[PDB]
Design an enzyme around this catalytic site. Structure first.
Site, PDB file in Angstrom:
ATOM      1  N   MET A  13       0.721  -1.076   0.174  1.00  0.00           N
ATOM      2  CA  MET A  13      -0.105  -0.434   0.213  1.00  0.00           C
ATOM      3  C   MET A  13       0.719   1.336  -0.422  1.00  0.00           C
ATOM      4  O   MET A  13      -0.041   2.321  -0.044  1.00  0.00           O
ATOM      5  CB  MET A  13      -1.170   0.074   1.270  1.00  0.00           C
ATOM      6  CG  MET A  13      -2.412  -0.653   1.279  1.00  0.00           C
ATOM      7  SD  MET A  13      -3.032  -0.605   2.573  1.00  0.00           S
ATOM      8  CE  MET A  13      -3.310   0.840   3.208  1.00  0.00           C
ATOM      9  N   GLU A  15       5.199   3.470  -0.097  1.00  0.00           N
ATOM     10  CA  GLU A  15       6.540   3.237  -0.317  1.00  0.00           C
ATOM     11  C   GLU A  15       7.434   4.208   1.600  1.00  0.00           C
ATOM     12  O   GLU A  15       6.198   5.566   1.610  1.00  0.00           O
ATOM     13  CB  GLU A  15       7.286   4.677  -1.082  1.00  0.00           C
ATOM     14  CG  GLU A  15       6.302   4.292  -2.593  1.00  0.00           C
ATOM     15  CD  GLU A  15       7.516   4.856  -3.103  1.00  0.00           C
ATOM     16  OE1 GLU A  15       7.670   5.990  -3.505  1.00  0.00           O
ATOM     17  OE2 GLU A  15       7.405   4.977  -4.573  1.00  0.00           O
ATOM     18  N   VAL A  16       8.320   4.100   1.608  1.00  0.00           N
ATOM     19  CA  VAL A  16       8.693   3.957   2.872  1.00  0.00           C
ATOM     20  C   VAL A  16      10.307   4.318   3.067  1.00  0.00           C
ATOM     21  O   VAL A  16      10.523   3.735   1.931  1.00  0.00           O
ATOM     22  CB  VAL A  16       8.910   2.637   4.397  1.00  0.00           C
ATOM     23  CG1 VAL A  16       9.256   3.614   5.436  1.00  0.00           C
ATOM     24  CG2 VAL A  16       7.111   2.630   4.165  1.00  0.00           C
ATOM     25  N   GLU A  84       8.984   6.013  13.921  1.00  0.00           N
ATOM     26  CA  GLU A  84      10.568   5.766  13.624  1.00  0.00           C
ATOM     27  C   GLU A  84      11.443   4.960  12.910  1.00  0.00           C
ATOM     28  O   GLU A  84      10.753   3.771  12.464  1.00  0.00           O
ATOM     29  CB  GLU A  84      10.382   4.755  15.227  1.00  0.00           C
ATOM     30  CG  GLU A  84      11.561   3.931  15.776  1.00  0.00           C
ATOM     31  CD  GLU A  84      11.454   3.161  16.805  1.00  0.00           C
ATOM     32  OE1 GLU A  84      12.273   2.300  17.579  1.00  0.00           O
ATOM     33  OE2 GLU A  84      10.138   3.575  17.743  1.00  0.00           O
ATOM     34  N   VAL A  86      13.868   1.980  11.283  1.00  0.00           N
ATOM     35  CA  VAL A  86      14.377   1.010  12.764  1.00  0.00           C
ATOM     36  C   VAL A  86      15.881   0.752  10.967  1.00  0.00           C
ATOM     37  O   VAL A  86      15.176   0.312  10.203  1.00  0.00           O
ATOM     38  CB  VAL A  86      13.717  -0.354  12.440  1.00  0.00           C
ATOM     39  CG1 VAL A  86      13.878  -1.518  13.067  1.00  0.00           C
ATOM     40  CG2 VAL A  86      12.828   0.232  13.015  1.00  0.00           C
ATOM     41  N   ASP A 129      -2.166  -8.911  11.609  1.00  0.00           N
ATOM     42  CA  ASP A 129      -1.398  -9.018  10.437  1.00  0.00           C
ATOM     43  C   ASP A 129       0.179  -9.683  10.186  1.00  0.00           C
ATOM     44  O   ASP A 129       1.146  -9.266  10.201  1.00  0.00           O
ATOM     45  CB  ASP A 129      -1.237  -7.706   9.657  1.00  0.00           C
ATOM     46  CG  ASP A 129      -0.693  -7.641   8.421  1.00  0.00           C
ATOM     47  OD1 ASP A 129      -1.271  -9.107   7.571  1.00  0.00           O
ATOM     48  OD2 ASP A 129      -0.423  -6.958   7.716  1.00  0.00           O
ATOM     49  N   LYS A 131       2.750 -11.625  10.203  1.00  0.00           N
ATOM     50  CA  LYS A 131       4.138 -11.542   9.719  1.00  0.00           C
ATOM     51  C   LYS A 131       5.777 -11.508   9.290  1.00  0.00           C
ATOM     52  O   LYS A 131       5.962 -10.592   9.910  1.00  0.00           O
ATOM     53  CB  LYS A 131       3.304 -11.291   8.156  1.00  0.00           C
ATOM     54  CG  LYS A 131       3.229 -10.107   7.152  1.00  0.00           C
ATOM     55  CD  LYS A 131       2.571  -9.839   6.320  1.00  0.00           C
ATOM     56  CE  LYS A 131       2.736  -7.910   5.515  1.00  0.00           C
ATOM     57  NZ  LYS A 131       1.650  -8.555   4.325  1.00  0.00           N
TER      58      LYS A 131
HETATM   59  N1  LIG Z   1       9.755   2.306  10.734  1.00  0.00           N
HETATM   60  C1  LIG Z   1      10.413   1.336   9.540  1.00  0.00           C
HETATM   61  N2  LIG Z   1      11.527   2.140   9.811  1.00  0.00           N
HETATM   62  C2  LIG Z   1      12.542   1.316   8.534  1.00  0.00           C
HETATM   63  N3  LIG Z   1      12.586   0.997   7.955  1.00  0.00           N
HETATM   64  C3  LIG Z   1      11.229   0.359   7.572  1.00  0.00           C
HETATM   65  C4  LIG Z   1       9.703   0.762   8.073  1.00  0.00           C
HETATM   66  N4  LIG Z   1       8.213   0.496   8.604  1.00  0.00           N
HETATM   67  C5  LIG Z   1       8.656  -0.551   7.104  1.00  0.00           C
HETATM   68  N5  LIG Z   1      10.051   0.166   6.507  1.00  0.00           N
HETATM   69  C6  LIG Z   1      10.216  -0.815   5.456  1.00  0.00           C
HETATM   70  O1  LIG Z   1       9.609  -0.176   4.271  1.00  0.00           O
HETATM   71  C7  LIG Z   1       8.961  -1.741   3.930  1.00  0.00           C
HETATM   72  C8  LIG Z   1       6.653  -1.713   4.025  1.00  0.00           C
HETATM   73  O2  LIG Z   1       6.905  -0.860   5.678  1.00  0.00           O
HETATM   74  P1  LIG Z   1       5.104  -1.474   5.829  1.00  0.00           P
HETATM   75  O3  LIG Z   1       4.951  -0.685   5.943  1.00  0.00           O
HETATM   76  O4  LIG Z   1       4.682  -2.970   5.948  1.00  0.00           O
HETATM   77  O5  LIG Z   1       3.978  -1.179   3.825  1.00  0.00           O
HETATM   78  P2  LIG Z   1       2.801  -1.532   4.266  1.00  0.00           P
HETATM   79  O6  LIG Z   1       2.357  -1.432   1.742  1.00  0.00           O
HETATM   80  O7  LIG Z   1       1.775  -1.362   5.409  1.00  0.00           O
HETATM   81  O8  LIG Z   1       2.613  -3.518   3.537  1.00  0.00           O
HETATM   82  P3  LIG Z   1       2.127  -4.453   3.286  1.00  0.00           P
HETATM   83  O9  LIG Z   1       2.168  -5.403   4.638  1.00  0.00           O
HETATM   84  O10 LIG Z   1       1.972  -5.217   1.531  1.00  0.00           O
HETATM   85  S1  LIG Z   1       0.249  -4.286   3.780  1.00  0.00           S
HETATM   86  C9  LIG Z   1       8.817  -2.815   5.136  1.00  0.00           C
HETATM   87  O11 LIG Z   1       9.464  -4.750   4.244  1.00  0.00           O
HETATM   88  C10 LIG Z   1      10.847  -2.724   5.866  1.00  0.00           C
HETATM   89  O12 LIG Z   1      11.208  -2.899   5.013  1.00  0.00           O
HETATM   90 MN   LIG Z   2       3.513  -4.606   6.187  1.00  0.00          MN
HETATM   91 MN   LIG Z   3       0.607  -2.572   5.745  1.00  0.00          MN
END
Ligand SMILES: Nc1ncnc2c1ncn2[C@@H]1O[C@H](COP(=O)(O)OP(=O)(O)OP(O)(O)=S)[C@@H](O)[C@H]1O
Ligand SMILES: [Mn+2]
Ligand SMILES: [Mn+2]
Length: 267
Positions: A13, A15-16, A84, A86, A129, A131
């Protein structure tokens, strides 16, 4: 305030990005909702609710949320979450690049994750969730649980519980199951159930017993099987009833004591 830098990761969903908070002079992680999905009210709404929920959880083993907001772009509003940073890697990444963990390290990581979940549970919050991708290990070896889910009206599904696949009720014992799945995978290199579609893995979760971890990878034990297979019991009544009961058995096994979980025998 937030000078954005290199992408840290991609999820389904969002990009971080890494960013520098220019006010406090710290590195933060900014999660930005995918521009294509932000046009869909249901995704936009999900993103907002997840941030709110996660801001209600302050604990050393849960990734903190610092701020929320929307950037007003030429294409439209783009919501984001400041959180935060990580400096580390997910368990997904770890299994991919280094393979299964040694049993002791697996136990340690999963016992630390039990503390994040016990804390959230006692605040009436189910993760939903759990995982490998939602648990990171920092460069100083801290376990960090993130991306807590939200309660809904009545990513991958490979770690969901049987009740979740069936649309049945979901409580802390669903997190226990899903944490068992992760534990299974960091010990063996594979999730307990695999298949050529989600419908097939869901059927496996509901109906098929997992192969005991020791049968799938060298260097494991029957005691460890007992613990893993108890978290993976099909009926929540047969699983660890709390994250703390699960951690207690993990700590026993780490210390070479017999777990309380029922014995698992193989021929
Ligand atoms: N706080 C953080 N610090 C460093 N890397 C992060 C952090 N949060 C997320 N990441 C990286 O960003 C990726 C995506 O983060 P998610 O929040 O899990 O994205 P999402 O879109 O909500 O994922 P899903 O499980 O498909 S819904 C992770 O696999 C990590 O590689
Ligand atoms: Mn996730
Ligand atoms: Mn998510």
């Amino acid at each position: 305030r937030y000078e954005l830098g290199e992408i840290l990761g991609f999820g389904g969903m969002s990009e971080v990005h890494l960013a520098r908070d220019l006010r406090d002079h710290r590195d933060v992680a900014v999660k930005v909702l995918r521009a294509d999905l932000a046009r869909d009210p249901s995704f936009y709404l999900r993103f907002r609710r997840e941030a709110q929920n996660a801001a209600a959880l302050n604990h050393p083993a849960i990734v903190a949320v610092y701020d929320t907001g929307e950037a007003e772009t030429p294409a439209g509003p783009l919501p984001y979450i400041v959180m935060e940073y990580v400096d580390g890697v997910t368990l997904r990444d770890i299994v991919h690049t280094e393979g299964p963990m040694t049993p002791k390290r697996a136990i340690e990581v999963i016992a630390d994750a039990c503390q994040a979940l016990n804390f959230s549970h006692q605040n009436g919050i189910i993760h939903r969730d759990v995982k490998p991708a939602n648990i990171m290990i920092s460069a100083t070896n801290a376990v960090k649980v993130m991306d807590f889910g939200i309660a809904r009206a009545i990513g991958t599904a490979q770690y969901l519980s049987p009740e979740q696949a069936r649309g049945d009720s979901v409580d802390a014992r669903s997190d226990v199951y899903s944490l068992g799945c992760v534990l299974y995978e960091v010990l063996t290199g594979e999730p307990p159930f695999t298949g050529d579609s989600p419908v097939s893995v869901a059927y496996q979760h509901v109906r098929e017993d997992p192969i005991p971890p020791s049968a799938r990878h060298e260097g494991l034990s029957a005691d460890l099987d007992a613990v893993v297979l108890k978290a993976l019991a099909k009926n929540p009544e047969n699983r660890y009833q709390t994250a703390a009961e699960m951690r207690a058995d993990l700590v026993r096994v780490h210390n070479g004591e017999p777990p309380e979980a029922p014995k698992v025998l193989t021929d």
